[PDB]
Amino acid sequence: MTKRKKISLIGSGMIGGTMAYLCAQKELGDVVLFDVVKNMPQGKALDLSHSSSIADTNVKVTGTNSYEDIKGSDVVIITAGLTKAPGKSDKEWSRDDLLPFNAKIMREVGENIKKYCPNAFVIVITNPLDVMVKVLHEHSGLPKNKVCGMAGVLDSSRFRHFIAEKLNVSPRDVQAMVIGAHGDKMVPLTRYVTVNGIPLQEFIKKGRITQEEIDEIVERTKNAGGEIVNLLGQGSAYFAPAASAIEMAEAYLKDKKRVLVCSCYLEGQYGHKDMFVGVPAVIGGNGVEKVIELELTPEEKELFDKSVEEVRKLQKAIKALGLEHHHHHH
Amino acid sequence: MTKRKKISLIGSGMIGGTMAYLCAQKELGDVVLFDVVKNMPQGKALDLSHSSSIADTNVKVTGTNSYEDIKGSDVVIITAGLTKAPGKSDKEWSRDDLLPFNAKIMREVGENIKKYCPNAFVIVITNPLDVMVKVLHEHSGLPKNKVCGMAGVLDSSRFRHFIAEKLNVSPRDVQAMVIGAHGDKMVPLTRYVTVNGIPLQEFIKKGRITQEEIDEIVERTKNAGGEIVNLLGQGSAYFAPAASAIEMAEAYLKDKKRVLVCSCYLEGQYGHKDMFVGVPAVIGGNGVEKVIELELTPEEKELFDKSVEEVRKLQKAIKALGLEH
Amino acid sequence: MTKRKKISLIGSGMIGGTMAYLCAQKELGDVVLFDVVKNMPQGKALDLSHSSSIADTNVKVTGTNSYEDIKGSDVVIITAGLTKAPGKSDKEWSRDDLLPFNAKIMREVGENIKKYCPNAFVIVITNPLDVMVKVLHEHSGLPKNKVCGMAGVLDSSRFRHFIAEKLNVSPRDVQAMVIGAHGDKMVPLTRYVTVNGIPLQEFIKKGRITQEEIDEIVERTKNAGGEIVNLLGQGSAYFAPAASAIEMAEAYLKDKKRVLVCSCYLEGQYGHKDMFVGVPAVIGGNGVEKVIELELTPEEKELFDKSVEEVRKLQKAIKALGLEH
Amino acid sequence: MTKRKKISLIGSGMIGGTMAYLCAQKELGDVVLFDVVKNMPQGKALDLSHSSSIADTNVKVTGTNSYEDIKGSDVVIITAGLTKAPGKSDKEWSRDDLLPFNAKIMREVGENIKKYCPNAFVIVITNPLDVMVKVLHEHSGLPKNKVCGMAGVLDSSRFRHFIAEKLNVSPRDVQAMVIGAHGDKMVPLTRYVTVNGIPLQEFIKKGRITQEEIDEIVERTKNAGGEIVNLLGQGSAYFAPAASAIEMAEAYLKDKKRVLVCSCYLEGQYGHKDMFVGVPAVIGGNGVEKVIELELTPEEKELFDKSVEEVRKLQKAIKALGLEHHHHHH
Ligand SMILES: NC(=O)C1=CN([C@@H]2O[C@H](COP(=O)(O)OP(=O)(O)OC[C@H]3O[C@@H](n4cnc5c(N)ncnc54)[C@H](O)[C@@H]3O)[C@@H](O)[C@H]2O)C=CC1
Ligand SMILES: NC(=O)C1=CN([C@@H]2O[C@H](COP(=O)(O)OP(=O)(O)OC[C@H]3O[C@@H](n4cnc5c(N)ncnc54)[C@H](O)[C@@H]3O)[C@@H](O)[C@H]2O)C=CC1
Ligand SMILES: NC(=O)c1ccc[n+]([C@@H]2O[C@H](COP(=O)([O-])OP(=O)(O)OC[C@H]3O[C@@H](n4cnc5c(N)ncnc54)[C@H](O)[C@@H]3O)[C@@H](O)[C@H]2O)c1
Ligand SMILES: NC(=O)c1ccc[n+]([C@@H]2O[C@H](COP(=O)([O-])OP(=O)(O)OC[C@H]3O[C@@H](n4cnc5c(N)ncnc54)[C@H](O)[C@@H]3O)[C@@H](O)[C@H]2O)c1
């Protein structure tokens, strides 16, 4: 027969479980919840199985501590890693501090994807996002188009939400993109914000929103992750991160050709190569099918290049870790 | 108790039945299917009721030949009318030719809404759309914000589909608007086409689409209705018209504040007043909450004004039939 | 790349177009609308394509007059055929009278499936359903588990709707099956009707429904198709038939293991073999995965056997037309 | 205008947030997330707002620490309370130990519903469920039909899932009910389990499932909550509890006339009155529109009555708490 789709969630914490719940609600495919922690993914998987019965969906949800259970996955979504570095206050939370904790996890996960599901589409969520996706790509041996990072869909959703709230319109009808690194140097593209294709500038000229208010929204978008960390007190955001990665997964599974901002492998676009960074892309059954090259103004391009320089600085730290290949398997 | 929403579909032909099906699938509210043809709406309502059981939804679908069954409707959607004028060929199909048959029907429907459901949000579909909506409005007594015509969501869906197909991207990510009259002088707004906010011009510059291809798509959008009439051989489009009207209805029922192009009563926007014509609008729980006045270029403004002039010409026929002015 | 599912709809009339609309709303897969009428499926496909843009779904809808476009289909759903026999009144409508017109069409469709998409799961709708499915199966060469007819989900949806309406509960919570032939000798299984597993008998005992009311509902279920034919005046039911077939298709495409009554090839269950007739079945990725043999009472068994005998009589006509045996 | 529906979630912890996410996904109405903990509901509400933008839904999600923000709620769902009593091991987890912690919370919540949204339909989740719903009803002054407890939909979903898994059929097609108290003396109604109306017994007679396997499933259903507590290590189940309460809310909001097992106020049915206990009911726009009286056999009825006696024993403990009315307002 043609089997249900199979989605493995490497990491069964807050984002992992929430993504599994979306998969159950949406009947996307069978789900494997993998974690290093014993019993917990099996417990969440039982709860999620019960929830599938309530939803009248037909979804097997399996919890596991064994990588071999990811064999034959169509999609793999990776959240394995730490959310907050120890000995740091909430207010000084930085994704950058997670780097030395999370890089070695990416190598392990990569080696296991290489062994058990080398044909999967792989979405990395673990921070610091743009360099974690590079480590994973390097150690997994996957095709450049079959690995990407979730960040832009989340950052863009934030930008959209804040603009839509201010204008009092449906967020369906706001288009907004945030490109570059997933961090403080992300680049919300104000000039590209539209309301059903109507430039945001029209609304400014009509006095429905001011430049000052837009500038505030751009900064709120940059700071949104930390805003939620400060309010929650434990961990980080999960409902929107989960939804963002599932939107990407959906695009792959059903070959939708969505235009989504993701951290993608560049091969010369925007003047850069051999790194992953946030750019608009077409996502379909071939994975990252196209990186779209925006006609950025010199000012936007300078912001983007400065963003990329933050990824290059993190990449130097990854190199200073020294990670050998074929550590776990080959 | 708070009751389910009640949606009355005045006209139970192709579009009306298809809209009822969406209401059953989406569990939007109870549905009244009204028509002047005896027994037909009752038959469709039984079929639709069976289909709600299959969908596991909770929807009463009532077919009727009596206007009294529209009492208390939250939303009324009007498709009553002819699709093709008697004695005309398919090749010469024109929405304008429907005018003398359908205008009288709008008057009658309006009179009934006025007594039975004056607080409804009313969506007109019957062609020729922009003048039909004005007849309905005038004879119903409804507030200007509580009546509109479905056209621009359909015309825009065509523009979006054709652009998305050429670019090979999801239509979710194509924004395209068509404003003006729902007819040959509709105005597909090429300058406003975006792919997730990215101007279509960027894709031209990169050679992903040519200006000639866009020009073809613009004309294909204008001609889409008659293309489908000629292909089908019977009637006219209905799957997309139904979905477009239901999108509008959902925006009202759930106070969504959608930005949708609809035929709206103008009160000076674009330099025009006291007609309905297609414009971007915010649709929510107060109906047409705002008409958005685009910063049209002089050339776009001219195209819009020539579109409005087609509505004004049709309105002269309405006045000459004794149906208002 | 793993491609989208491909669903071919052989017949692009009322049911075929409505099923395409569900596929577009539900984003089930790309759709091919095939018909012998030139240009009509192409027109509907354009309309449906526009409607997918409105739905924000990602669905190619292709209309065609060429069987070659069914190549590689995952699912094929067959509605090609007549709905009413020429020269008969509505009051005397009988599915049996369609047999000599529609049987030849099943042969032709089968021959094409055999070369172009022999690995498809095939759902037959064309009437008279139980014998049409057997002609298709025989001339297609498909495995017995890969072909079935849609009938029992529709008949059961009617039984469910009528019971749910009388009890004033959600039809989600009514389980009712109708087995046997899709015709006047269908068998609504009163003893198996439940409300969330609670036997209907409990509601009789409490006076929420009477035996006379149930008896009326049983007959209304049997007569439902012809009731809708008489009300509509044109054609026959389509909203519930479409939804029923799409429910079946979804069970296959997503390996759901739904328990649905379908016309299935019997291999000794109920004491019968080598015919298709309505039985409860588990539908999943291997098609008809299991026929469930109910513990019928002697009286129920007799009703089922008399239903099977109606299929056997129709099959004699099939043999006499030279279409198998 | 006719406003969106308004759903207030009193308690913004694991179940509360998860219910808010379902409301955002399903576009059920605007959501108020109330909690006594400062900042946390506001943080979750931001994350959920972002997720609504991703979902293309039109949902306002507000976090609050003020009861007045529940004014005009159509539905109120209460999870306010403790999940695990202190100083107890996971293996000895009991809903009964939560009683003295949670009763006073119910009085406070009730008094505020009375003041701010007396026309709401109220779904209680806080354990120990059947007596918490009684405390809430007593102190809120709501109509008997406008308050109920979520338990049976969850317990029944579990019974359904386990049966459906064993038979390898869609859980849509399994009907199973668990009635009585939400605890160890719940009563899974084996005789009423059906597969599209086909008695489970047919499947036993055909050898597709054994009585021994059914008996195991009945006990697994009784123990399911504790099973998940043991596996998770922290807190209790949330994905299915949330889904269960939203299914009940949906039934109300859209007047669906669903047949759902809920903890309902009895007025003589089953031989009992003036308590809430799990029974099948029709749920629609009038709330609990009908309690269905099953034709229980004497053996099933004995199990049900013993279940009710557990609720009566908890109720005596509630009485021994002594709670005065008009403590917070009136
Ligand atoms: N974008 C737009 O605004 C579109 C507009 N249309 C128009 O919508 C209208 C309906 O199209 P279809 O549903 O396809 O046509 P249809 O012919 O299938 O149905 C029209 C129904 O109106 C009924 N009707 C006629 N006079 C009536 C009366 N006084 N009251 C109640 N019902 C009455 C008829 O009996 C018939 O069932 C046509 O005028 C057509 O031109 C259609 C497509 C797109
Ligand atoms: N429960 C059931 O099994 C139900 C069965 N039916 C049956 O389904 C069939 C279709 O019903 P509708 O869609 O309402 O009819 P319809 O008349 O609207 O469409 C049938 C289509 O089949 C096409 N067709 C005829 N010969 C063909 C050929 N060789 N190949 C391709 N297409 C061809 C026609 O041109 C037409 O478009 C009828 O036989 C009807 O009795 C209908 C309702 C319920
Ligand atoms: N936009 C973004 O890209 C974005 C947004 C939010 C969170 N994040 C990141 O996502 C990651 C997960 O966040 P969360 O809230 O789900 O965290 P969490 O702490 O709730 O869960 C992470 C899980 O990873 C597991 N884990 C640790 N090591 C592992 C290993 N070697 N293999 C498998 N599992 C392992 C842990 O046991 C834990 O269950 C964090 O790195 C966080 O910074 C990124
Ligand atoms: N089937 C059932 O009925 C069922 C199933 C699961 C959980 N539960 C119960 O649901 C309740 C909630 O579980 P959870 O996992 O969401 O717990 P949780 O600890 O994650 O959240 C409970 C929240 O209640 C808040 N709270 C405490 N006192 C409050 C007050 N006076 N007002 C408002 N908020 C207050 C807390 O601050 C906390 O955020 C528990 O009592 C648990 O036993 C019942």
- Which ligand is nearest the CA of A245, by number? 3
Q: Which two tokens stand for residue A189?
A: 């593209």
Within 13 Å of residue C283, how many CA atoms lie on the same side as its CB?
A: 31
D282 neighbors D180 (Cβ within 8 angstroms): no
User: In CATH, which of 3.30.450.20, 3.40.50.261, 3.90.110.10, 3.50.50.60 is domain A152-330?
Assistant: 3.90.110.10
CB D136 within 8 A of CB D263: no
Centre a 10 Å sphere on the Cβ of residue C232 and count the other Cβ atoms it contains.
23
SS3 C151: coil
Please state, in angstroms and as integers, the Cα–Cα distance from residue D64 to each residue in D21, D35, D40, following that order. 16, 7, 9
d(CA D2, CA B75): 12
* Partners of residue B149 on adjacent β-strands: B124, B263
Could you tell me the distance, in angstroms and rounded to a whole number, from the CA of residue A51 to the centre of ligand 4?
18
Count, in order, helices (H) and strands (E) of chain D. Answer: 9, 14
Residue B207 backbone zone (phi > 0: left; psi -120 to 50: alpha; other: beta): left
B61-64, strands of its sheet edge to edge: B61-64, B30-34, B6-10, B75-78, B121-124, B147-149, B258-267, B273-284, B287-291
Cβ atoms of C121 and C76 closer than 8 Å? yes
Measured distance CA(C277)–CA(C182) in Å, rounded: 8
C-alpha closest to that of A123 among A138, A112, A141, A136: A136
**Which of B137, B161, B182, B272 is flagged as catalytic?**
B182
**Which residue reads 């009202």 in tokens?**
B252
| C·D CB contacts under 8 A | 77
Contact present, D205 and C295 (Cβ < 8 Å): yes
Q: Which residues pair with D124 in a beta bridge?
A: D78, D149
Residue D322: count other Cβ atoms within 10 Å of its Cβ: 6
Selected residue of B155, B159, B170 to mutate for chain A interface (largest A Cβ count, 10 A): B170
Query: B304 in helix, strand or coil?
Result: helix
Residue of B nearest to D287 (CA): B1
CB C172 to CB B42 under 8 A? Answer: no
CB contact under 8 A, D285 and B1: yes
- Residues of chain C contacting B53 with CB distance shorter than 8 Å: 157-158, 160-161, 164, 171, 174, 240
Task: Please state how this structure was obtained.
Answer: X-ray
Cα separation, D326 vs D308, in Å, equals 29
Give the integer Cα–Cα distance in Å for D24 and D55. 8
What's the rounded Cα separation, in Å, for the pair B241 and B13? 12
Question: Which residue has its alpha carbon closest to ligand 1 atom 14?
Answer: B14
Q: Which of C43, C232, C237 lies nearest to residue B231, judging by beta carbons?
A: C43
Residue type, A187: V
d(CA A138, CA B305) in angstroms, rounded, equals 59
| Chain-chain contact of A3 with C255 (C-beta, under 8 angstroms) | yes
Put simply, the answer to whether B285 touches D2 (Cβ < 8 Å) is yes
- Going from N- to C-terminal start, the domains of chain D cover 1-151, 152-330
Would you call B272 a catalytic residue per the annotation? Answer: no
Nearest to A278 by CA among A160, A165, A188: A188
C230 contacts: CB under 8 Å, gap ≥ 6: B39, B43, C90, C91, C93
Residues 6+ apart with CB under 8 A from C13: C35, C79, C83, C235
Q: Whose Cα sits closest to atom 10 in ligand 4?
A: D126
Burial class (CB in 10 A: 0-12, 13-18, 19+), C301: middle
Pairing mode, if any, of strands C121-124 and C147-149? parallel
Alpha-carbon distance D257 to nearest alpha carbon in chain A (angstroms): 16
Rounded distance from Cα C41 to ligand 2 centre (Å): 13
**How many CB atoms are located within 10 Å of the residue C270 CB?**
18
- Mutation choice for ligand 2 from C106, C236, C247, C263, CB with most ligand atoms inside 8 A: C236
Which residues of chain A does C27 touch, with a Cβ-Cβ cutoff of 8 Å? 254
Phi, psi of A81 (to 5 degrees): 150, 175
| CB nearest B254 (choices: D58, D257, D258) | D58
Residue of A nearest to B192 (CA): A197
Contact D280 C173 (CB under 8 A): no
Beta bridge partners of C194: C175, C199
Residue of C nearest to D283 (CA): C169
Identify the burial level of C219 via C-beta atoms within 10 angstroms of its C-beta, where 0-12 means exposed, 13-18 middle and 19 or more buried: exposed
Cβ neighbours for B145, distance < 8 A, ≥ 6 positions apart: B265, B286, B287, B288, B289
Cis peptide before D128 (omega within 30 of 0): yes
CA of C78 to the centre of ligand 2 (A): 8
Q: How far apart are CA B243 and CA C21, in angstroms?
A: 10
Instruction: Give the SS3 label for residue C7.
Output: strand
Instruction: Say if residue B280 is preceded by a cis peptide, omega within 30 of 0.
Output: no
Partnered with residue B32 across adjacent β-strands are: B8, B62
Residues framing ligand 3 (Cβ under 6 A): A 10-16, 35-37, 79-83, 98, 102, 105, 108, 125-127, 129, 150-151, 154, 182, 235-238, 241
C302 vs D252: CA distance, rounded Å: 44
Q: Helices C14-26 and C239-253 meet at what angle, rounded to 10?
A: 50
Report whether CATH 3.90.110.10 matches the domain B152-325. Answer: yes
Residue type at position D239: F
* Residue whose structure tokens are 């048959």: B101
Show the 3-state SS of chain A.
CCCCCEEEEECCCHHHHHHHHHHHHHCCCEEEEECCCCCHHHHHHHHHHHHHHHHCCCCCEEEECCHHHHCCCCEEEECCCCCCCCCCCCCCCCHHHHHHHHHHHHHHHHHHHHHHCCCCEEEECCCCHHHHHHHHHHHHCCCHHHEEECCHHHHHHHHHHHHHHHHCCCHHHEECCEEECCCCCCEECHHHCEECCEEHHHHHHCCCCCHHHHHHHHHHHHHHHHHHHHHHCCCCCCHHHHHHHHHHHHHHHCCCCEEEEEEEEEECHHHCEEEEEEEEEEEECCEEEEECCCCCCHHHHHHHHHHHHHHHHHHHHHHHHCCCCCCCCC
**Residue among D54, D64, D193, D261 with most chain A CBs within 10 A, to mutate:** D54
Q: Is the CB of B278 under 6 A from ligand 1?
A: no
Residue in D137, D139, D161, D182 annotated catalytic: D182
Of the CA atoms within 13 Å of residue C91, those in its CB half-sphere come to: 0
Strand C6-10, strand C30-34: pairing: parallel
Q: How far is CA C144 from CA A89, B31, C140, D43, in A?
A: 66, 41, 11, 57
- Give me the torsion for CA of D33, D39, D44, D46, rounded to 10°: 100
Contact C159, C177 (CB under 8 A): yes
- For chain D, list the strands marked E by DSSP: 6-10, 30-34, 61-64, 75-78, 121-124, 147-149, 174-175, 178-179, 187-188, 194-195, 198-199, 258-267, 273-284, 287-291
User: Does the distance separating the beta carbons of A257 and B168 come in below 8 Å?
Assistant: yes
**Residue in chain A lying closest to B282 (CA):** A169
Tokens of D229: 């507590």
Are the C-beta atoms of A20 and A9 separated by less than 8 Å? yes
Amino acid at D275: M
Q: Where do we find the tokens 């059914």?
A: D214
| CA angle at D157 for the pair D155 and D162, rounded to the nearest 5° | 100
Helical axes B14-26 vs B239-253, angle rounded to 10°: 50
Cα D68 versus chain centre, distance: 24
Q: Which numbered ligand comes closest to the C-alpha of A150?
A: 3
Contacts of B253 in chain D (CB under 8 A): 2
Question: Which residues make Cβ contacts (< 8 Å) with residue C162, sequence separation at least 6?
Answer: C217, C220, C221
What is the dihedral angle through the alpha carbons of B202, B204, B208, B209, rounded to the nearest 10 degrees? 140
The token pair at A59 is 């979804």
Breaks (C-N over 2.5 A) in chain A follow: none
| Chain D residues inside the 8 Å CB shell of C175 | 175, 194, 196-197
Residue of C nearest to A26 (CA): C26
Distance CA C76, CA C97 (A): 25
Distance from CA of B153 to the nearest CA of C (A): 8
Q: Which of D154, D158, D239 sits opposite A21 (nearest CB)?
A: D239
Largest CA distance in chain A: 62
- Give chain A's length: 330
Question: Ligand 3 mean position to B184 CA, how many Å?
Answer: 56
Contact of A309 with A181, CB cutoff 8 Å = no
Residues of B in contact with A294 (CB under 8 A): 198, 202
Closest chain C C-alpha to A132 CA, distance in angstroms: 25
CA distances from D62 to B230, D32, D114, D158 (A): 52, 5, 21, 32
Fold of C1-151: Rossmann fold (3.40.50)
User: What does D35-65 look like in DSSP terms, one character per residue?
Assistant: -SSSSHHHHHHHHHHHHHHHHT----EEEES
Contact C278, C262 (CB under 8 A): yes
Query: Is C95:C129 a contact under the CB 8 Å cutoff?
Result: yes
Other beta carbons within 10 Å of B173: 23
Radius of gyration for the alpha carbons in chain C, expressed in angstroms and rounded: 19
- Taking the CA of residue C188 and the nearest CA in chain B, the distance in Å comes to 15
Helix (H) or strand (E) holding D203: helix D200-205
Q: Which residues of B193-210 are buried (b: 16+ CB within 10 A; e: fewer)?
A: bbbbbbbbbbbeeeebbe
Residue numbers in D near B121 (CB within 8 A): none
Ligand 4 residue neighbourhood (C-beta within 6 Å):
D 10-16, 35-37, 79-83, 98, 102, 105, 108, 125-127, 129, 150-151, 154, 182, 235-238, 241
The residue to mutate among B9, B35, B77, B277, having the most atoms of ligand 1 within 8 angstroms of its beta carbon, is: B35
Distance CA B278, CA C19 (A): 31
Q: What residues are paired with C258 via a beta bridge?
A: C283
Q: What is the DSSP string of D253-277?
A: HTT--EEEEEEEEEESGGG-EEEEE
Which one, of A169, B154, B239, lies nearest residue C44 by Cα?
B239
Residues 6+ apart with CB under 8 A from D283: D148, D248, D251, D252, D256, D257, D258, D259, D260, D262, D289
Neighbouring CB atoms inside 10 A of D36's CB total 13
Tell me the pairing of strands C30-34 and C61-64. Answer: parallel
DSSP states along B127-145: SSHHHHHHHHHHHH---GG
Closest by Cβ to D254, choosing from B4, B254, B285: B4
Give how far A73 is from chain C: nearest CA, Å.
Answer: 12
| Set C139, C161, C182, C325: catalytic member | C182
Burial class of residue D217, CB neighbours in 10 A (0-12, 13-18, 19+): buried
The answer to whether the Cβ–Cβ distance between D257 and C193 falls below 8 Å is: no
- The reply to whether residue C285 touches residue A1, judged by beta carbons under 8 angstroms, is yes
Please, which residues have CB within 8 angstroms of residue C150's CB and are 6 or more apart in sequence? Answer: C123, C124, C125, C129, C241, C244, C245, C248, C262, C263
Contact partners of C by the rule of 3+ C-beta pairs under 8 A? Answer: A, B, D
Q: Is there a contact between C122 and C76 (Cβ–Cβ < 8 Å)?
A: yes
